Design a protein around this motif. Structure first.
Motif, PDB file in Angstrom:
ATOM      1  N   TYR A 170       0.929  -1.278   0.144  1.00 16.89           N
ATOM      2  CA  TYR A 170       0.732  -0.328  -0.324  1.00 16.89           C
ATOM      3  C   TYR A 170       0.658   1.028  -0.564  1.00 16.89           C
ATOM      4  N   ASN A 171       1.538   1.305   0.564  1.00 18.64           N
ATOM      5  CA  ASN A 171       2.905   2.483   1.162  1.00 18.64           C
ATOM      6  C   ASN A 171       3.465   3.067  -0.168  1.00 18.64           C
TER       7      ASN A 171
ATOM      8  N   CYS B 212       2.140   2.267  -3.950  1.00 14.05           N
ATOM      9  CA  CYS B 212       1.606   2.882  -3.965  1.00 14.05           C
ATOM     10  C   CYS B 212       0.867   4.221  -3.936  1.00 14.05           C
ATOM     11  N   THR B 213       1.270   5.157  -3.394  1.00  8.69           N
ATOM     12  CA  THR B 213       0.674   6.644  -2.999  1.00  8.69           C
ATOM     13  C   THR B 213       2.222   6.963  -3.132  1.00  8.69           C
TER      14      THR B 213
END
Lengths: 138, 69, 207, 321
Positions: free
Chosen positions: C34-35, C37-38
């Motif tokens: 998740y980290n 992809c941002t």
């Protein structure tokens, strides 16, 4: 049963499995105490509260007033709450938070929007005239 | 009932408007324009070439036809 | 990125060859994904595809050419473990499937396609031939361990390729039809043709 | 807090809740928001009913990636000066709009994936239809009232267009027997509904026979204001196996009571025969054939986008009230 969720600094909150089932991530995870290092306990408790109030939900646009009053707080925690709702991927919560932000943006001028959202303006004093030119037909 | 108007024109087209009573008036479509078949089915009595060319919003019960010279 | 990638690889290597890891590890991995992809993660997708192909080739190096009766005992177990662990992996890297693979490939289906490249190998004809050899106990002998056959059959049915064929629909039994049903039917015809007349030349037709 | 740190999918999810004026307004905040004001997912469905506008404005908007462009009765009386890429529009409504021939030619010379079209009331010509020949996927079409083009143009258009489902080639005020002949000669073979009214002195029983013998799948049909259709045409429609809604309104050459025989075609549902039936005798026709619907709807439906702001069942999200 239940499950013990631990935030970024150890505030293990036990919550019924049927409540944490709202969080799709945790759902597919219990398919096969845990730390969620992207969420501080402060926001986490509010998330738990929102899930509990919605725990038996059926499953503009008439924001439910319960959420509305639940949303009656300032920028910073609204920002953090939206980010956490994304990170856990719970549909309705992100839906209503997005709608709230949308409506609060509704109406105000670019200057007010820029001030309130603390956005660093750029490429100005020659191009804003052009982009306004791209908007006569409004 | 169906009231007609005289012909008034500029150099290129010749126009006419027609007023309708309530019963026929409450049938006129608010979305698209009409065609000769359509307004003849309504009950107009006139020639070939008349074209229904706009709708006046405040009063829907008035039709506007034009035709070339 | 890179510093994320090494630990992600370590965790993925853990999830295959399963040792029942703990949910803390999996939240670490999911937070990593998740980290990243941002900051829109194509290169991560490329890494995943490459790693899957590499690992599957490494496995195929072993187990190739066991000639029968173990190629099943091998293939079924390998397919089972691979399917389960791949389902877990689809669980982990689930942020992709919602916000970048919507602009086109879901990780599960990618793993299925790569295992299909493990099918279009000597692991295709040998397996079917051994299964037919096993069913050749049509005559007698309860050696047909039904669980040694249902595994392969379900694997074929599942492996009906799906990578943007149309979209998730349902039973895609193309592979089953074109790679196992045919040989089964033909060999059944042949075997019955033989044994029928063989018996017929010896007995009153009543029997 | 730095709300510029927000990720793009979150920003798009936010922007997917606005209205067109505000969406335009926010575009002038910072370059990133300027980019995100136009991301080909916000511009799915446009709506510009009656609004005056300009060729470059509509060209830019269409190039942004519109799908369903609804612009009826709008006025575009200015020359287009810029070029673009092949558009992505799939449904286009332009009914009754006052547009220039050159501007319309320029606009249509870019769209190629047209799944549904409307051009009611407008005026066309040979270059326009020649360019329109490319649209090899037209499910529907609608050319009512149009005028100006030629027979070679019409035959080329109808030959190139193969999948044409419904056709409304009605009421054009310059046609000839040649026009209608080549039309019915080259009409595609899947026509479910077709309209050919108006052409009083150009519709002939030979051409109608050609039509009914070529296309076997007419479901809705009208031939209004035709003055040379007789009861032989009647038996022609008897070969049609799917005619559910026929309308020969104001067809004079037809004697009223042979209309009773129409009830004998099995799959009929409605028959609008305005003009010929003397009043009171409508009850006579109802008693003669009570298994139908006579004069129950005045208005056509053959490829009309709107009969309810939704074009063809699609909803326009970006609008202006």
């Amino acid at each position: 049963p239940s499950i013990k969720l631990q935030s970024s600094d150890g505030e293990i909150f036990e919550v019924d499995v049927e409540i944490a089932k709202q969080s799709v991530t945790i759902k597919t995870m219990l398919e096969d105490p845990v730390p969620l290092p992207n969420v501080n306990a402060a926001i986490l408790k509010k998330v738990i509260q929102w899930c509990t109030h919605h725990k038996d939900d059926p499953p503009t646009d008439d924001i439910p007033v319960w959420d509305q009053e639940f949303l009656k707080v300032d920028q910073g925690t609204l920002f953090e709450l939206i980010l956490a709702a994304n990170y856990l991927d719970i549909k309705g919560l992100l839906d209503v938070t997005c709608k709230t932000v949308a409506n609060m943006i509704k109406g105000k001028t670019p200057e007010e929007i820029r001030k309130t959202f603390n956005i660093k303006n750029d490429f100005t004093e020659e191009e804003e005239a052009q982009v306004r030119k791209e908007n006569q037909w409004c | 009932q169906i009231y007609y108007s005289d012909k008034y024109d500029d150099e290129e087209f010749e126009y006419r408007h027609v007023m309708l009573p309530k019963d026929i008036a409450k049938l006129v479509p608010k979305t698209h324009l009409m065609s000769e078949s359509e307004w003849r089915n309504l009950g107009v009595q006139q020639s070939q070439g008349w074209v229904h060319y706009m709708i006046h919003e405040p009063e829907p019960h008035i039709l506007l036809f034009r035709r070339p010279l | 990125l890179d510093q994320i990638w090494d630990d992600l690889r370590a965790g993925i290597q853990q999830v295959y060859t399963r040792q029942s890891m703990a949910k803390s590890r999996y939240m670490e991995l999911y937070t990593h994904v998740y980290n990243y992809c941002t900051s829109v993660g194509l290169e991560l997708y490329k890494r995943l595809k490459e790693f899957l192909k590499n690992y599957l080739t490494n496995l195929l190096k072993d187990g190739e050419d066991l000639m029968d009766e173990s190629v099943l005992k091998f293939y079924t177990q390998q397919w089972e473990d691979y399917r389960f662990s791949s389902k877990v992996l689809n669980g982990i890297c689930a942020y992709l499937n919602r916000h970048w693979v919507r602009r086109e490939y879901e990780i599960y289906s990618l793993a299925l396609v790569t295992w299909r490249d493990c099918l279009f190998r000597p692991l295709n004809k040998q397996v079917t031939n051994a299964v037919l050899k096993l069913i050749e106990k049509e005559r007698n002998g309860e050696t047909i361990n039904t669980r040694l056959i249902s595994g392969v059959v379900q694997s074929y049915v599942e492996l009906g390729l799906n990578e943007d064929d149309a979209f998730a629909k349902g039973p895609t039994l193309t592979v089953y039809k074109e790679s196992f049903e045919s040989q089964f039917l033909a060999d059944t015809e042949r075997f019955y043709t033989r044994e029928s007349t063989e018996f017929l030349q010896q007995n009153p037709v009543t029997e | 807090v730095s709300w510029d740190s927000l990720p793009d999918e979150l920003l798009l999810g936010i922007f997917s809740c606005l209205c067109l004026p505000e969406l335009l307004k926010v575009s002038g905040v910072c370059k990133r928001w300027y980019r995100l004001a136009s991301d080909e997912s916000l511009w799915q469905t446009l709506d510009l009913t009656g609004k005056n506008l300009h060729p470059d404005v509509t060209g830019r908007l269409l190039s942004q990636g519109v799908i369903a462009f609804r612009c009826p009765r709008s006025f575009m009386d200015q020359p287009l000066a810029e070029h673009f890429s092949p558009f992505r529009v799939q449904h286009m409504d332009l009914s009754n709009s006052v547009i220039e021939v050159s501007t319309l030619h320029g606009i249509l010379s870019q769209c190629s994936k047209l799944q549904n079209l409307s051009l009611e009331g407008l005026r066309l010509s040979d270059p326009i239809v020649n360019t329109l020949a490319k649209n090899s996927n037209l499910v529907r079409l609608n050319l009512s009232g149009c005028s100006g083009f030629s027979e070679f143009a019409l035959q080329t258009l109808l030959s190139s267009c193969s999948r044409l489902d419904e056709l409304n080639l009605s009421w054009c005020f310059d046609f000839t027997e040649k026009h209608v002949q080549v039309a019915v000669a080259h009409v595609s073979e899947t026509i479910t509904q077709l309209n050919l009214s108006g052409y009083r002195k150009n519709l002939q029983k030979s051409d109608l026979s050609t039509l009914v013998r070529r296309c076997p799948n007419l479901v809705h049909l009208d031939l209004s204001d035709s003055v040379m259709l007789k009861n032989d045409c009647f038996q022609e429609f008897f070969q049609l196996n799917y005619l559910q809604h026929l309308s020969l309104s104001r067809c004079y050459d037809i004697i009223p009571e042979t209309l009773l025989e129409l009830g004998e075609i099995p799959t009929l549902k409605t028959l609008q025969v305005f003009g010929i039936v003397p009043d009171g005798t409508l009850q006579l026709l109802k008693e003669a054939l009570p298994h139908l619907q006579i004069n129950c709807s005045h208005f056509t439906t053959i490829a009309r986008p709107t009969i309810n702001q939704e074009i063809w069942g699609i909803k326009c999200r970006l609008t202006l009230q």
